[PDB]
Design a protein around this motif. Structure first.
Motif, PDB file in Angstrom:
ATOM      1  N   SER A 106     -98.036-113.053 -29.891  1.00  0.00           N
ATOM      2  CA  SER A 106     -97.856-111.536 -30.469  1.00  0.00           C
ATOM      3  C   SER A 106     -98.346-110.748 -30.033  1.00  0.00           C
ATOM      4  CB  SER A 106     -98.716-111.993 -31.734  1.00  0.00           C
ATOM      5  OG  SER A 106     -98.898-113.473 -31.941  1.00  0.00           O
ATOM      6  N   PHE A 107     -98.063-109.263 -30.509  1.00  0.00           N
ATOM      7  CA  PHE A 107     -98.140-107.932 -29.600  1.00  0.00           C
ATOM      8  C   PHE A 107     -97.628-106.682 -30.813  1.00  0.00           C
ATOM      9  CE2 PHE A 107     -95.543-111.221 -26.239  1.00  0.00           C
ATOM     10  CZ  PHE A 107     -96.444-110.910 -25.149  1.00  0.00           C
ATOM     11  N   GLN A 108     -96.769-106.313 -30.801  1.00  0.00           N
ATOM     12  CA  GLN A 108     -96.023-105.450 -32.028  1.00  0.00           C
ATOM     13  C   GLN A 108     -95.628-104.478 -31.679  1.00  0.00           C
ATOM     14  OE1 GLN A 108     -98.224-104.940 -34.937  1.00  0.00           O
ATOM     15  NE2 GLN A 108    -100.368-104.447 -33.301  1.00  0.00           N
ATOM     16  N   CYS A 109     -94.492-103.720 -32.515  1.00  0.00           N
ATOM     17  CA  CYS A 109     -93.296-103.179 -32.943  1.00  0.00           C
ATOM     18  C   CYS A 109     -93.712-102.036 -31.744  1.00  0.00           C
ATOM     19  CB  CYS A 109     -92.152-102.572 -33.842  1.00  0.00           C
ATOM     20  SG  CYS A 109     -90.908-101.979 -33.261  1.00  0.00           S
ATOM     21  N   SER A 110     -92.770-101.511 -31.656  1.00  0.00           N
ATOM     22  CA  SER A 110     -93.282-100.051 -30.574  1.00  0.00           C
ATOM     23  C   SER A 110     -92.990 -98.735 -32.077  1.00  0.00           C
ATOM     24  CB  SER A 110     -92.483 -99.730 -29.186  1.00  0.00           C
ATOM     25  OG  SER A 110     -92.276-100.772 -28.271  1.00  0.00           O
ATOM     26  N   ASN A 111     -92.194 -99.334 -32.500  1.00  0.00           N
ATOM     27  CA  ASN A 111     -92.367 -98.161 -34.212  1.00  0.00           C
ATOM     28  C   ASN A 111     -93.186 -98.975 -35.365  1.00  0.00           C
ATOM     29  OD1 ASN A 111     -89.247 -97.284 -32.439  1.00  0.00           O
ATOM     30  ND2 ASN A 111     -89.651 -99.640 -32.145  1.00  0.00           N
ATOM     31  N   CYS A 112     -92.627 -99.945 -35.441  1.00  0.00           N
ATOM     32  CA  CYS A 112     -93.560-100.513 -36.580  1.00  0.00           C
ATOM     33  C   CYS A 112     -94.459-100.631 -36.819  1.00  0.00           C
ATOM     34  CB  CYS A 112     -92.515-102.225 -36.651  1.00  0.00           C
ATOM     35  SG  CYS A 112     -90.488-101.280 -37.383  1.00  0.00           S
TER      36      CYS A 112
ATOM     37  N   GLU B 105     -96.620-109.693 -38.028  1.00  0.00           N
ATOM     38  CA  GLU B 105     -95.557-111.066 -39.453  1.00  0.00           C
ATOM     39  C   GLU B 105     -94.467-111.208 -39.000  1.00  0.00           C
ATOM     40  OE1 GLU B 105     -99.052-109.950 -41.589  1.00  0.00           O
ATOM     41  OE2 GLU B 105     -99.657-110.683 -39.929  1.00  0.00           O
ATOM     42  N   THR B 106     -94.199-111.114 -38.022  1.00  0.00           N
ATOM     43  CA  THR B 106     -92.188-110.972 -37.412  1.00  0.00           C
ATOM     44  C   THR B 106     -91.687-112.402 -37.534  1.00  0.00           C
ATOM     45  OG1 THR B 106     -93.479-109.118 -35.919  1.00  0.00           O
ATOM     46  CG2 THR B 106     -91.221-109.543 -35.904  1.00  0.00           C
ATOM     47  N   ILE B 107     -91.030-112.470 -38.975  1.00  0.00           N
ATOM     48  CA  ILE B 107     -90.103-113.190 -39.059  1.00  0.00           C
ATOM     49  C   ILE B 107     -89.308-113.364 -38.240  1.00  0.00           C
ATOM     50  CG2 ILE B 107     -88.022-112.474 -39.690  1.00  0.00           C
ATOM     51  CD1 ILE B 107     -89.085-114.566 -42.248  1.00  0.00           C
TER      52      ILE B 107
ATOM     53  N   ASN C 135     -89.104-108.350 -29.081  1.00  0.00           N
ATOM     54  CA  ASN C 135     -90.080-107.833 -27.633  1.00  0.00           C
ATOM     55  C   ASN C 135     -88.887-107.971 -26.107  1.00  0.00           C
ATOM     56  OD1 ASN C 135     -93.014-108.123 -29.331  1.00  0.00           O
ATOM     57  ND2 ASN C 135     -91.617-110.256 -28.743  1.00  0.00           N
ATOM     58  N   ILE C 136     -88.604-108.616 -26.074  1.00  0.00           N
ATOM     59  CA  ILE C 136     -87.578-108.651 -24.730  1.00  0.00           C
ATOM     60  C   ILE C 136     -87.967-107.979 -23.823  1.00  0.00           C
ATOM     61  CG2 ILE C 136     -86.344-106.370 -25.928  1.00  0.00           C
ATOM     62  CD1 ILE C 136     -83.983-107.019 -24.271  1.00  0.00           C
ATOM     63  N   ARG C 137     -88.849-109.709 -23.062  1.00  0.00           N
ATOM     64  CA  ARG C 137     -89.915-108.996 -21.882  1.00  0.00           C
ATOM     65  C   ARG C 137     -88.533-108.364 -20.665  1.00  0.00           C
ATOM     66  NH1 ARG C 137     -88.604-113.739 -17.840  1.00  0.00           N
ATOM     67  NH2 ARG C 137     -90.529-114.239 -19.051  1.00  0.00           N
ATOM     68  N   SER C 138     -89.121-106.584 -21.077  1.00  0.00           N
ATOM     69  CA  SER C 138     -88.929-105.548 -20.152  1.00  0.00           C
ATOM     70  C   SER C 138     -89.521-104.597 -19.588  1.00  0.00           C
ATOM     71  CB  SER C 138     -87.740-105.497 -20.631  1.00  0.00           C
ATOM     72  OG  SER C 138     -86.632-105.943 -21.221  1.00  0.00           O
ATOM     73  N   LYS C 139     -89.452-103.821 -20.556  1.00  0.00           N
ATOM     74  CA  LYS C 139     -90.505-102.901 -20.447  1.00  0.00           C
ATOM     75  C   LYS C 139     -91.120-102.563 -22.157  1.00  0.00           C
ATOM     76  CE  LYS C 139     -86.316 -99.359 -19.556  1.00  0.00           C
ATOM     77  NZ  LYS C 139     -86.113-100.004 -21.240  1.00  0.00           N
ATOM     78  N   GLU C 140     -90.488-101.891 -23.284  1.00  0.00           N
ATOM     79  CA  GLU C 140     -90.765-101.542 -24.222  1.00  0.00           C
ATOM     80  C   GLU C 140     -91.238-102.418 -25.079  1.00  0.00           C
ATOM     81  OE1 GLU C 140     -88.044-100.194 -23.272  1.00  0.00           O
ATOM     82  OE2 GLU C 140     -88.383 -98.741 -22.471  1.00  0.00           O
ATOM     83  N   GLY C 141     -91.506-102.554 -26.113  1.00  0.00           N
ATOM     84  CA  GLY C 141     -91.921-103.935 -27.340  1.00  0.00           C
ATOM     85  C   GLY C 141     -91.519-103.966 -28.444  1.00  0.00           C
ATOM     86  N   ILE C 142     -90.383-104.156 -29.177  1.00  0.00           N
ATOM     87  CA  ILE C 142     -89.725-104.375 -30.039  1.00  0.00           C
ATOM     88  C   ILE C 142     -90.181-105.212 -30.961  1.00  0.00           C
ATOM     89  CG2 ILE C 142     -87.155-102.850 -31.796  1.00  0.00           C
ATOM     90  CD1 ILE C 142     -86.642-101.987 -28.933  1.00  0.00           C
ATOM     91  N   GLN C 143     -91.265-105.771 -30.817  1.00  0.00           N
ATOM     92  CA  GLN C 143     -91.855-107.052 -32.499  1.00  0.00           C
ATOM     93  C   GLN C 143     -90.805-106.987 -33.461  1.00  0.00           C
ATOM     94  OE1 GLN C 143     -94.923-105.506 -34.753  1.00  0.00           O
ATOM     95  NE2 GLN C 143     -93.174-105.444 -35.449  1.00  0.00           N
ATOM     96  N   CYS C 144     -90.505-106.235 -33.744  1.00  0.00           N
ATOM     97  CA  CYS C 144     -89.837-105.994 -35.174  1.00  0.00           C
ATOM     98  C   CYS C 144     -88.515-106.639 -34.514  1.00  0.00           C
ATOM     99  CB  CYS C 144     -89.807-104.931 -36.019  1.00  0.00           C
ATOM    100  SG  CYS C 144     -88.564-103.716 -35.387  1.00  0.00           S
ATOM    101  N   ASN C 145     -87.405-106.880 -36.062  1.00  0.00           N
ATOM    102  CA  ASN C 145     -86.243-107.323 -36.222  1.00  0.00           C
ATOM    103  C   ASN C 145     -85.471-105.775 -36.721  1.00  0.00           C
ATOM    104  OD1 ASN C 145     -87.131-108.023 -38.895  1.00  0.00           O
ATOM    105  ND2 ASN C 145     -85.707-109.125 -38.934  1.00  0.00           N
ATOM    106  N   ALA C 146     -86.627-105.222 -36.880  1.00  0.00           N
ATOM    107  CA  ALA C 146     -85.164-103.905 -37.854  1.00  0.00           C
ATOM    108  C   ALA C 146     -84.982-103.264 -37.092  1.00  0.00           C
ATOM    109  CB  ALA C 146     -86.587-103.399 -38.800  1.00  0.00           C
TER     110      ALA C 146
END
Ligand SMILES: [Zn+2]
Length: 56
Positions: free
Chosen positions: A1-7, A11-13, A17-28
């Motif tokens: 588990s990580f975290q979003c870079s905005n949210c 608990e992300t349904i 994150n997409i292994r690259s640089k930033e981590g958009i954990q959320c789907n929103a």
DNA sequence: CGGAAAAGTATACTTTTCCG
DNA sequence: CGGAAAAGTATACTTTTCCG
């Protein structure tokens, strides 16, 4: 588990994150941005009709 | 007031990696 | 070396707001 870079919601349904640089954990952030970034794919609209075809 | 388009979130399919 | 499982990716589908 990580975290979003905005949210930031452990608990992300479904993550994004997409292994690259930033981590958009959320789907929103990614999916909602479809219209907020450019012309949202008409693909989702084609099936959207499923509602508009019943009553109008 | 109702319908159409926008929006939003879950889910369905898919991939990538790890380990038996 | 391939299966399995979770994350990834985007469409699906229902709701809401707003303007005709
Ligand atoms: Zn986010």
């Amino acid at each position: 588990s990580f975290q979003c870079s905005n949210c930031s919601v452990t608990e992300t349904i479904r993550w994004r994150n997409i292994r690259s640089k930033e981590g958009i954990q959320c789907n929103a952030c990614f999916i909602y941005q479809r219209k907020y970034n450019k012309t949202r794919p008409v693909t989702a609209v084609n099936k959207y009709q499923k509602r508009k075809l019943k009553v109008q």
